Amino acid sequence: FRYMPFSPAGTPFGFTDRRYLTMNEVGYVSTVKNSEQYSITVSFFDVGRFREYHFEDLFGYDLCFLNEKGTLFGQSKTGQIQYRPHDSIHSNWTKIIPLQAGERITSVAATPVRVIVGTSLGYFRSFNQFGVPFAVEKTSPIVALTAQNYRVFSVHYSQFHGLSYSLSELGTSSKRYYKRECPLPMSLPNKDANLDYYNFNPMGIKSLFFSSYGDPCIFGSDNTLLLLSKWRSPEESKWLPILDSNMEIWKMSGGKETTDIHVWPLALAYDTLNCILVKGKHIWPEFPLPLPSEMEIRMPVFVKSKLLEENEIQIPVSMAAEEEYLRSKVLSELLTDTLENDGEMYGNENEVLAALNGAYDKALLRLFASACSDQNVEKALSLAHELKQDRALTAAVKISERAELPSLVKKINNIREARYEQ
Amino acid sequence: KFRYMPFSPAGTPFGFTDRRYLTMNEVGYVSTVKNSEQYSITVSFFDVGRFREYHFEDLFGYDLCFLNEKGTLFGQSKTGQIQYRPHDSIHSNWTKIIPLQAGERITSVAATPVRVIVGTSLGYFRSFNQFGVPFAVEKTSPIVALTAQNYRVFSVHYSQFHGLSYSLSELGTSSKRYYKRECPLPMSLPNINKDANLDYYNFNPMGIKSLFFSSYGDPCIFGSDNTLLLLSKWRSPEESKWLPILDSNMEIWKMSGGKETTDIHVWPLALAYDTLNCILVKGKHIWPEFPLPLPSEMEIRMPVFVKSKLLEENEIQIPVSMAAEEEYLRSKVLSELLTDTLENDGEMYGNENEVLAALNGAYDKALLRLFASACSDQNVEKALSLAHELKQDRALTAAVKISERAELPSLVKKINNIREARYEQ
Amino acid sequence: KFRYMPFSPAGTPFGFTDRRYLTMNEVGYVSTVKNSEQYSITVSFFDVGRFREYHFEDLFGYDLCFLNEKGTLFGQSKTGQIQYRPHDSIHSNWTKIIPLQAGERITSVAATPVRVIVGTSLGYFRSFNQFGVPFAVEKTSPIVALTAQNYRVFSVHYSQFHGLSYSLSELGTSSKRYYKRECPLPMSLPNIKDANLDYYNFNPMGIKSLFFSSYGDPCIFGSDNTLLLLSKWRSPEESKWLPILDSNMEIWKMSGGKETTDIHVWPLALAYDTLNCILVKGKHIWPEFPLPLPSEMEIRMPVFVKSKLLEENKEIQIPVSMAAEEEYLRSKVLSELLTDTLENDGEMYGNENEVLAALNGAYDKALLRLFASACSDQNVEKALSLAHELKQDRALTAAVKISERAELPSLVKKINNIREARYE
Amino acid sequence: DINIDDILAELDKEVSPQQDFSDLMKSWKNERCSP
């Protein structure tokens, strides 16, 4: 296998002198072939908080990670790295890392506390934010890295271990591995415009990041956003394919099987994905970088044939109700998990969770009304068991009264009793 | 280059014959006949005394099926249509379409009284209540076989990039628990590198003939090696371990008097306690024909035996000490499985305490035959180790008597020390 | 494509000669001689006070072996014959045939004081007690390699359909415990000169040996010639493999560089901090029958940039910054392993506490030597973060003295805040 | 860089039968060879 270097949302050169190294919520990094020298630019989307800068590079940095506090750079073959704080009162620092014969650096990452470097032979090296080496570990070969506060999330692959990931947190007492080289359910790539990309990023991992609420995410060659739910309890963790961007682009294309619209993922923030909508022949963004944009998260329950039969695309309400019930359930679970373990990050999530549970029950009531209109008792009764709030159970009682179906009325009243008698 | 195929438990190829099975089960079996390029499905039972056979034209081409106690679940691998048909008609039949991405297939489906589950060649795990409402969506490694019982689901995964692995899960009322989570599965794939075998493995490259939960809820699987694997102590993840409780090739070799016959094969239905319910296939093709044989049985048997010994010392007869080795190990594993069931799940059939007592009897009796085999050679240390393995006091005094008639006074003292350490509690 | 082969720890091929080693470890070594149609096996020990060497004529041609304190375990991979030999001979030798399917082989064997363990190429995993009574059969991924120390068993699995993985257990006389089951093993397998090809024909996995530290931590030495040690294995959520010795780099260093080749490390055991091994010279990677004295290499954390050392040295000497980095890391990891051993297993020689105290001394001294260079670059924050790492409060006073001599009153102030906190 | 080996020395500082035998060896050698 090839083991080319990775960085979040980086792009190839593609017979062009310019390319991007990284893209994040905070900004993006790019480089120019300045003859044998390279020019490098560090650019920001919040130009209020941050300021752009340049430097000229003789090493040819091709790895990068753009943390809010500072930018980390690396040279894959020579093994040199350099860290550049944005608050330039803090000094830059450089470290040349030991690389064995035939080894490369494959990924790097940075945080307020800790810096991480991974190699094609699976060495996993740790430094504090001032360049003191704090640890060395061996894993299966690192192919991707990302980090947030004390939490680190990594992907591994080899011919002899298979595609897999680790999730870790440096507790102040000790490091904990929540999950450790567990198999990763992402699809690898299966013409030439695609092949020019896969010669640069053979794993097809377009980006690898934590949510705003600190939940791991990955965006693969299948162009779906996977989010690892309930990672805080490995007995119960679930990779959720929370968004299929092919489906959403197809819907926004009015049912057209467009070859000329693609998405580049930046970061998830609650019910939306920050991303860049690139168009045309190449599947990666070009030098005049288009503006960031938000897609909603929408779970893949849509049936393509039924939607083009119904039909911009407009959804039949029963299918939409299924999607909204499902998505509100998973987002509610994520918000409860984050609130219980980590508290309110933004002083907003408790109120958002109340509104979200409202959306959950409202979607279920649309499904319950649909089932009652078909006079299906058993489906409707099961749907009533899912209802979370007494307002929704009372509404279901009146809906089943409206549907002239008193068996449901009596049974749901007894369910309501079994709830409120506690 | 690999090709995924739809799978269901104990389903079969067509071959060049238009009649085919989709699945077989302790409840019954399902078959189709490709009449006028639609499919007259037949649903049939082994305990007809409480269930009617029934029959309908499938115009969609269901190639996936899962029969269970409460109903049957069908699926069409390409279009994504799935259909559920209860056995009574007080509950309604229902049908739903599942999304397929480009180049995808549904690869297996499963059902329970409280859950319906679907898996695909891109690893989408989609699950519903028994009325078709989607209760969850999840992604895994690509699912290639799937089965369930009550709240519990067992699934098998494969790809070039993950390797053969399994997951075991249960719907808790609060949340779904994974006991094991894409852990590597010690089953053997078929040798891909004979024409009837090639035809079957073209139909089913993964080589899984069937996979099911035991009568006591233990997951079981049966592959190209024709051994039955049971995941013992699945209830505790760190120490759960696969037991190869039966080799059907070895038992067929025994029952055929040591002859290396090519013309008899065992088709699994389900494990119930000490016995695999199965259909013994015969002839060139290695799967059952349209007139099914009756559901036959084999006892499970731990593979302690070796051909090079039974050939000389033996329709095959077995030497007493080696027979005791098998009986001892089988009683041990069965006793542990029923003890874990009784502790974790209670009595599922209302008599397991008495079955456990019978197993303890068989256990200690086989140990006593081994104790005699050791005292025969005056192997005091081996005999004393066996004395620690004995558990009922009756068997400990029997071991004293065997030591006496073999004149090991050392064992008389040491066995009575074991007894004294125990009965003083 | 791949073939399963029998393995025993640090056993060697025949090569172009008629005798080889079946195994060698901290206890001793076993060798076999192709004495025409039969084999002459000799079992030799390093502690001649406890154990006496013995030999016997072998008509089965055993190709598997394992050697603990209590007895020798032998196996013939192709016929399923195994034999176990207690070293006192007050307990009897015993022999058994375990069943094999056609083409199946025993791939590895191991023994513990109350168990004998056999793993086959189809992944059956058969347990007998030390007197040969069958006790259990499992099925796992095929056990390409396997060893034990006291009651702790450490096994390595591989197949084309599972990848490389390992299990670690503590079977005991009671409380039979499993620490990790078939977790992926981060070791590197060999690339697909002819002595190397001959060795990998004998041992396709390229595991040269596999063993435990004297304090009971799993170790393995792969085709990369890098000793890996599994740290914090006693609590699985924190366990991590540490590359404690890149022996290629250390051979290159101790030979003065110069592209030194045709000398190879054959590992026997780690002891505390010092790999006992044979330094084989020449084209063949493996030792010869007149077993050379097992030379000693102290472990070295891999922080040595070869290009930097080439620029410095153009007999090799290490810059004090790099030396202090390696000293700090090595002392930290060794102190962690000693602390875990003393918490869980306790003292065995009765001086490990003194060793750990002296080791913390080396750790703090390395941190102070790094702190001095950080202060020489006048970086207050790098200096302070280094100051946070020190363990002894009394050692932390020396950081005040250094930052005075490096004219950083900000650093002195911050360190005195650390003194005031550490006083608690 | 700032040298600190004396600081580290003041951190590090925190008749025998062998000496008598070595002194006897010294005395024996000096005695044998001296006039």
Side-chain angles (χ1 to χ4, degrees), chain A residues 1-390 392-409 411-422, chain B residues 1-313 315-402 404-425, chain C residues 1-410 412-424, chain D:
Chain A
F1 185 67
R2 309 303 297 124
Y3 291 111
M4 303 302 186
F6 165 86
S7 43
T11 70
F13 280 120
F15 59 79
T16 312
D17 298 338
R18 169 81 72 170
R19 80 181 190 85
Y20 300 98
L21 305 190
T22 331
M23 308 181 187
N24 301 83
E25 293 200 65
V26 303
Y28 61 102
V29 177
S30 66
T31 187
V32 179
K33 299 189 185 186
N34 198 355
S35 187
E36 299 185 302
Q37 173 181 306
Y38 300 85
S39 194
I40 287 173
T41 309
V42 179
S43 303
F44 298 90
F45 297 130
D46 192 341
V47 186
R49 290 182 75 182
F50 315 112
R51 303 296 179 276
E52 164 165 297
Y53 62 82
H54 292 58
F55 63 94
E56 297 305 309
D57 172 24
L58 292 302
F59 319 112
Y61 294 145
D62 48 4
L63 297 123
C64 176
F65 189 91
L66 186 64
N67 177 265
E68 61 280 349
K69 303 305 190 182
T71 314
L72 181 62
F73 291 90
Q75 214 301 318
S76 60
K77 298 194 183 184
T78 73
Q80 181 167 323
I81 63 154
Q82 176 174 5
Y83 182 65
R84 295 180 68 116
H86 301 155
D87 286 323
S88 191
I89 182 168
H90 301 284
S91 183
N92 298 347
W93 62 259
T94 298
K95 184 68 68 177
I96 301 178
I97 288 175
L99 274 283
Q100 287 136 54
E103 193 178 20
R104 305 192 197 108
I105 300 181
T106 55
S107 281
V108 304
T111 61
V113 180
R114 171 173 163 128
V115 163
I116 310 98
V117 177
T119 70
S120 61
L121 294 181
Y123 288 85
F124 181 86
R125 297 175 185 276
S126 172
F127 310 82
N128 72 356
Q129 69 284 71
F130 314 109
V132 178
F134 265 20
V136 184
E137 173 178 349
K138 196 171 182 171
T139 65
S140 55
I142 297 286
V143 294
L145 293 176
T146 195
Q148 175 151 309
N149 298 334
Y150 290 94
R151 293 166 188 173
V152 180
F153 166 47
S154 60
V155 178
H156 318 243
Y157 170 75
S158 80
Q159 304 191 13
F160 315 109
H161 297 102
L163 183 64
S164 48
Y165 72 104
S166 302
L167 180 64
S168 195
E169 181 171 44
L170 179 64
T172 55
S173 301
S174 56
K175 178 174 279 283
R176 180 172 184 179
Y177 275 93
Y178 286 106
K179 297 192 68 55
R180 185 169 175 83
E181 298 188 33
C182 294
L184 178 75
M186 194 199 76
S187 184
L188 297 198
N190 306 96
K191 291 288 188 183
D192 296 357
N194 310 275
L195 307 181
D196 289 353
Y197 183 72
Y198 300 138
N199 273 264
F200 160 80
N201 186 6
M203 302 306 295
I205 303 166
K206 289 182 176 176
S207 195
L208 189 85
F209 48 85
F210 283 82
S211 310
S212 63
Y213 301 121
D215 298 323
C217 299
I218 187 169
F219 197 94
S221 69
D222 53 43
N223 309 320
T224 69
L225 183 65
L226 315 179
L227 183 150
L228 181 56
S229 181
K230 293 179 78 66
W231 62 264
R232 301 178 175 76
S233 54
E235 185 171 36
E236 313 183 21
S237 310
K238 297 176 288 182
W239 275 108
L240 303 178
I242 60 171
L243 170 60
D244 178 3
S245 296
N246 317 276
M247 173 56 72
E248 284 298 321
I249 291 299
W250 176 82
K251 281 161 63 180
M252 297 297 94
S253 306
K256 291 181 179 178
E257 297 294 350
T258 184
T259 54
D260 300 348
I261 303 176
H262 306 275
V263 64
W264 218 244
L266 271 49
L268 180 139
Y270 182 42
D271 200 8
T272 44
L273 168 66
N274 301 274
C275 54
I276 286 176
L277 290 162
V278 56
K279 300 183 174 176
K281 183 179 180 182
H282 293 157
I283 63 177
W284 58 91
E286 292 291 356
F287 167 46
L289 190 58
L291 284 159
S293 65
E294 280 180 357
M295 286 198 178
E296 277 195 338
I297 305 306
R298 288 293 181 163
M299 301 199 71
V301 303
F302 303 107
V303 182
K304 175 168 286 186
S305 58
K306 185 162 288 189
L307 287 188
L308 62 83
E309 171 175 301
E310 177 61 20
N311 300 261
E312 176 177 315
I313 281 187
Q314 306 193 2
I315 308 300
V317 59
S318 197
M319 185 185 297
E322 286 190 2
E323 191 276 327
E324 288 179 344
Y325 146 74
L326 181 66
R327 198 178 83 266
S328 184
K329 194 174 184 173
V330 301
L331 287 166
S332 174
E333 182 62 12
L334 292 166
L335 260 69
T336 55
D337 191 45
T338 57
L339 283 165
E340 285 174 22
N341 202 92
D342 305 335
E344 279 191 318
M345 313 283 85
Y346 311 123
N348 182 38
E349 299 89 312
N350 189 59
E351 188 62 35
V352 167
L353 177 57
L356 183 60
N357 293 335
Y360 166 93
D361 272 354
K362 186 58 169 174
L364 276 169
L365 287 176
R366 278 175 283 159
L367 293 181
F368 181 87
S370 180
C372 286
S373 74
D374 300 333
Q375 221 70 10
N376 188 321
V377 170
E378 56 271 31
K379 185 176 179 176
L381 182 59
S382 179
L383 284 160
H385 293 165
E386 280 288 78
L387 300 172
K388 277 282 180 184
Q389 291 140 108
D390 190 20
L393 279 158
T394 49
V397 164
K398 287 182 291 188
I399 287 158
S400 49
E401 287 277 34
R402 194 187 300 162
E404 70 267 355
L405 192 42
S407 179
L408 283 176
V409 177
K411 292 287 180 289
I412 295 170
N413 266 279
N414 188 236
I415 291 291
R416 199 203 166 210
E417 289 156 19
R419 192 168 298 197
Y420 64 60
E421 288 171 328
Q422 301 178 17
Chain B
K1 191 171 67 179
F2 179 75
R3 301 176 296 154
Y4 289 85
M5 296 294 178
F7 166 86
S8 31
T12 67
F14 289 102
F16 54 89
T17 298
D18 299 322
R19 175 67 75 161
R20 164 180 171 238
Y21 296 96
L22 307 186
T23 175
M24 313 176 189
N25 182 267
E26 70 280 6
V27 172
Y29 61 98
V30 176
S31 63
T32 57
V33 73
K34 200 171 64 176
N35 50 288
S36 301
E37 210 160 47
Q38 70 258 9
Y39 304 86
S40 278
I41 310 212
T42 306
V43 180
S44 293
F45 292 79
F46 300 116
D47 57 351
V48 171
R50 63 182 173 123
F51 291 124
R52 309 276 58 71
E53 297 195 299
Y54 59 92
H55 180 290
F56 59 90
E57 287 278 48
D58 165 34
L59 312 178
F60 320 98
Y62 300 144
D63 47 6
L64 293 160
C65 182
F66 192 87
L67 177 61
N68 82 96
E69 277 277 332
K70 201 61 53 172
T72 179
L73 176 67
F74 288 96
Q76 152 56 273
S77 180
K78 277 280 186 172
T79 75
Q81 179 167 316
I82 63 153
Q83 173 169 95
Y84 186 62
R85 301 179 79 112
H87 289 160
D88 68 83
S89 300
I90 296 158
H91 307 79
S92 185
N93 300 345
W94 61 259
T95 307
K96 209 178 197 290
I97 311 303
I98 284 171
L100 277 293
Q101 271 71 13
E104 190 176 17
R105 280 176 170 274
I106 297 181
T107 46
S108 198
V109 306
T112 60
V114 65
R115 201 185 184 184
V116 163
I117 311 93
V118 177
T120 76
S121 67
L122 296 175
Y124 288 85
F125 180 101
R126 298 173 179 274
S127 186
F128 311 80
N129 61 4
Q130 66 276 24
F131 314 116
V133 179
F135 273 30
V137 174
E138 167 174 345
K139 209 176 195 296
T140 64
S141 298
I143 296 163
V144 65
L146 179 62
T147 193
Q149 181 189 105
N150 190 21
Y151 294 112
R152 300 176 181 162
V153 179
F154 178 93
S155 58
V156 177
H157 313 255
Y158 176 77
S159 70
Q160 292 180 358
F161 317 112
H162 298 116
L164 191 74
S165 47
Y166 74 99
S167 303
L168 175 63
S169 61
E170 182 173 39
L171 283 192
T173 52
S174 185
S175 61
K176 182 176 71 179
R177 166 152 77 166
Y178 275 101
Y179 290 93
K180 300 290 279 164
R181 184 53 149 159
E182 300 193 16
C183 300
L185 183 65
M187 194 206 76
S188 185
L189 276 66
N191 182 11
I192 287 160
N193 302 274
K194 193 178 180 182
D195 56 1
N197 307 79
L198 286 159
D199 186 6
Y200 182 79
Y201 295 129
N202 182 52
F203 152 73
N204 179 15
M206 202 52 42
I208 299 166
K209 301 194 193 282
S210 191
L211 76 177
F212 43 82
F213 282 68
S214 74
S215 59
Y216 298 105
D218 305 329
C220 304
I221 188 154
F222 194 103
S224 294
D225 52 51
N226 310 336
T227 70
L228 183 69
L229 310 179
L230 184 161
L231 181 59
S232 66
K233 303 202 79 68
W234 63 264
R235 297 160 168 98
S236 183
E238 64 191 32
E239 59 194 327
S240 61
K241 64 201 206 286
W242 287 98
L243 305 182
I245 59 178
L246 170 61
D247 179 7
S248 64
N249 284 13
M250 170 49 61
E251 290 301 308
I252 289 290
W253 182 87
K254 287 180 188 164
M255 296 300 96
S256 59
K259 177 166 59 180
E260 302 292 351
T261 185
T262 47
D263 301 1
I264 308 176
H265 307 274
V266 182
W267 202 252
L269 300 179
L271 176 72
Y273 176 34
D274 197 14
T275 46
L276 171 57
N277 306 279
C278 54
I279 288 167
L280 276 82
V281 173
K282 300 184 182 175
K284 179 174 173 72
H285 289 164
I286 63 181
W287 58 90
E289 210 211 318
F290 177 52
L292 280 187
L294 293 171
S296 305
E297 287 181 14
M298 292 187 136
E299 295 172 345
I300 54 140
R301 289 298 174 177
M302 304 292 279
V304 298
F305 312 93
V306 62
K307 285 190 180 182
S308 303
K309 186 165 181 176
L310 289 177
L311 277 170
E312 312 306 334
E313 205 65 27
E315 298 189 329
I316 296 300
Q317 296 287 3
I318 300 181
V320 178
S321 306
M322 184 152 63
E325 288 177 351
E326 202 296 309
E327 289 287 353
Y328 163 51
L329 289 183
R330 221 178 75 269
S331 309
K332 176 181 277 283
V333 303
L334 289 168
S335 179
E336 289 186 356
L337 290 168
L338 287 184
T339 306
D340 289 359
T341 307
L342 285 154
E343 290 293 323
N344 182 250
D345 291 320
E347 287 199 328
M348 292 166 67
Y349 303 90
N351 77 113
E352 290 83 300
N353 276 261
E354 299 150 49
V355 186
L356 181 68
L359 282 159
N360 288 5
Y363 170 95
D364 284 323
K365 188 167 186 184
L367 275 162
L368 283 168
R369 280 187 286 166
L370 295 172
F371 190 92
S373 304
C375 291
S376 158
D377 309 357
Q378 294 78 68
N379 195 325
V380 175
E381 57 273 28
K382 188 173 179 179
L384 182 54
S385 76
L386 294 156
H388 284 77
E389 274 286 291
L390 289 167
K391 61 174 68 196
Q392 73 196 252
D393 300 339
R394 186 194 66 81
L396 301 181
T397 184
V400 175
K401 296 299 184 72
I402 292 161
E404 285 184 337
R405 69 190 65 159
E407 66 269 358
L408 291 320
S410 50
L411 288 178
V412 171
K413 290 186 182 179
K414 295 287 182 178
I415 280 49
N416 277 292
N417 290 15
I418 298 167
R419 291 177 72 206
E420 288 154 25
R422 286 183 181 175
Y423 63 68
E424 290 279 33
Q425 302 306 318
Chain C
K1 292 186 178 185
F2 176 84
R3 196 197 304 115
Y4 285 102
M5 295 295 287
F7 163 92
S8 280
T12 68
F14 282 116
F16 297 97
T17 70
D18 56 331
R19 67 191 302 160
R20 78 187 186 86
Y21 295 99
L22 301 184
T23 186
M24 58 191 76
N25 57 15
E26 68 272 20
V27 183
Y29 56 101
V30 184
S31 61
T32 184
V33 188
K34 192 180 293 186
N35 180 23
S36 79
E37 302 299 318
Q38 65 188 58
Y39 290 86
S40 312
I41 285 172
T42 308
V43 174
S44 302
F45 299 93
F46 288 123
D47 193 316
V48 299
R50 290 176 67 191
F51 311 118
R52 299 199 301 208
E53 157 170 304
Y54 66 93
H55 70 90
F56 58 97
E57 292 296 309
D58 173 20
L59 310 180
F60 318 100
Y62 297 131
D63 52 6
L64 294 151
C65 191
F66 177 83
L67 181 73
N68 60 20
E69 303 196 336
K70 301 296 187 173
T72 320
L73 180 66
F74 287 96
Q76 161 49 271
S77 68
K78 279 178 177 277
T79 77
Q81 174 93 328
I82 62 146
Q83 178 176 5
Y84 177 70
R85 311 201 72 152
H87 290 152
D88 60 10
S89 193
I90 304 300
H91 294 169
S92 183
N93 313 275
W94 56 257
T95 304
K96 184 168 286 301
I97 296 180
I98 68 100
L100 302 169
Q101 278 68 268
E104 183 180 6
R105 300 170 77 168
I106 300 170
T107 48
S108 62
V109 300
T112 229
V114 299
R115 259 196 181 191
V116 166
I117 299 170
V118 179
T120 71
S121 63
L122 299 188
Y124 297 90
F125 181 83
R126 301 174 183 275
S127 297
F128 311 86
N129 72 353
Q130 72 280 40
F131 314 110
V133 180
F135 260 53
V137 182
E138 303 172 46
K139 212 175 188 294
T140 66
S141 297
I143 306 89
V144 291
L146 173 68
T147 62
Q149 186 194 80
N150 298 347
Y151 302 103
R152 290 158 182 177
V153 184
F154 167 45
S155 64
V156 172
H157 314 257
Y158 179 75
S159 79
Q160 302 292 64
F161 314 124
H162 304 126
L164 194 69
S165 60
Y166 75 98
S167 300
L168 174 62
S169 311
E170 180 169 53
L171 302 174
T173 186
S174 65
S175 76
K176 201 182 304 306
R177 179 170 171 94
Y178 295 87
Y179 284 89
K180 296 184 68 57
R181 294 284 301 205
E182 280 154 314
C183 288
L185 183 72
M187 199 197 75
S188 304
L189 301 187
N191 302 313
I192 298 171
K193 194 193 297 181
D194 290 356
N196 299 274
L197 284 298
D198 194 6
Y199 178 66
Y200 298 133
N201 272 264
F202 162 82
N203 174 240
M205 304 308 301
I207 300 165
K208 289 181 173 179
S209 198
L210 185 172
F211 48 83
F212 291 74
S213 69
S214 61
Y215 297 120
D217 312 299
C219 294
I220 188 165
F221 194 98
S223 69
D224 57 9
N225 311 313
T226 306
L227 184 62
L228 316 177
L229 174 143
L230 181 65
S231 182
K232 305 203 76 66
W233 60 268
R234 297 174 178 83
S235 57
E237 69 284 356
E238 306 198 328
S239 309
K240 50 181 173 175
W241 282 99
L242 307 180
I244 55 174
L245 169 54
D246 176 9
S247 70
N248 306 300
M249 169 51 67
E250 190 61 16
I251 282 284
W252 175 91
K253 186 195 294 166
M254 77 187 283
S255 59
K258 298 194 72 168
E259 303 181 32
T260 297
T261 312
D262 304 341
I263 178 165
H264 323 271
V265 171
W266 203 258
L268 265 59
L270 177 55
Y272 157 50
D273 66 338
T274 302
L275 177 69
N276 289 93
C277 59
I278 288 81
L279 267 51
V280 186
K281 304 186 185 184
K283 65 187 293 188
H284 299 105
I285 302 99
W286 56 87
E288 287 293 339
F289 166 62
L291 185 60
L293 297 188
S295 186
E296 278 182 351
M297 300 181 75
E298 196 208 330
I299 64 176
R300 298 266 76 89
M301 302 299 291
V303 295
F304 301 98
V305 188
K306 199 168 61 173
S307 184
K308 188 175 282 291
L309 297 182
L310 281 161
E311 287 181 341
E312 286 291 335
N313 293 268
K314 297 182 172 73
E315 295 191 281
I316 281 163
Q317 186 179 18
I318 304 302
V320 294
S321 308
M322 299 170 67
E325 283 182 356
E326 184 263 306
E327 191 67 14
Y328 157 73
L329 290 171
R330 194 194 72 262
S331 54
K332 190 170 71 159
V333 300
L334 282 171
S335 71
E336 188 69 3
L337 294 161
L338 262 288
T339 306
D340 287 339
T341 307
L342 272 49
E343 285 286 316
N344 292 272
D345 299 335
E347 300 172 316
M348 57 181 292
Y349 291 125
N351 73 327
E352 297 89 333
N353 267 286
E354 285 88 328
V355 176
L356 174 54
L359 189 59
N360 294 336
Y363 165 90
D364 285 337
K365 185 166 173 175
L367 278 163
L368 287 157
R369 205 169 195 85
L370 285 169
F371 177 93
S373 66
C375 287
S376 303
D377 298 348
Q378 296 279 272
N379 189 323
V380 171
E381 297 300 334
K382 192 172 183 182
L384 176 55
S385 53
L386 283 161
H388 271 282
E389 283 286 287
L390 283 76
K391 280 167 179 290
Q392 289 287 0
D393 188 47
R394 184 265 311 295
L396 181 59
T397 69
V400 183
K401 187 52 59 189
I402 295 163
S403 46
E404 288 177 337
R405 271 154 64 150
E407 72 264 7
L408 295 182
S410 308
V412 167
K413 182 180 182 183
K414 287 289 199 294
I415 295 156
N416 291 340
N417 308 348
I418 309 311
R419 293 298 323 291
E420 189 61 33
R422 191 66 57 89
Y423 163 85
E424 301 189 334
Chain D
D1 288 2
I2 304 299
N3 184 279
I4 62 157
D5 297 321
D6 55 336
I7 299 171
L8 301 177
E10 69 174 37
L11 178 60
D12 285 331
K13 66 181 189 167
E14 298 283 66
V15 172
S16 70
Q18 299 82 15
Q19 189 61 56
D20 293 324
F21 177 65
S22 188
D23 294 354
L24 177 67
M25 288 293 299
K26 170 167 67 72
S27 305
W28 174 62
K29 290 163 71 181
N30 287 352
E31 187 74 80
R32 175 63 70 80
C33 193
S34 56

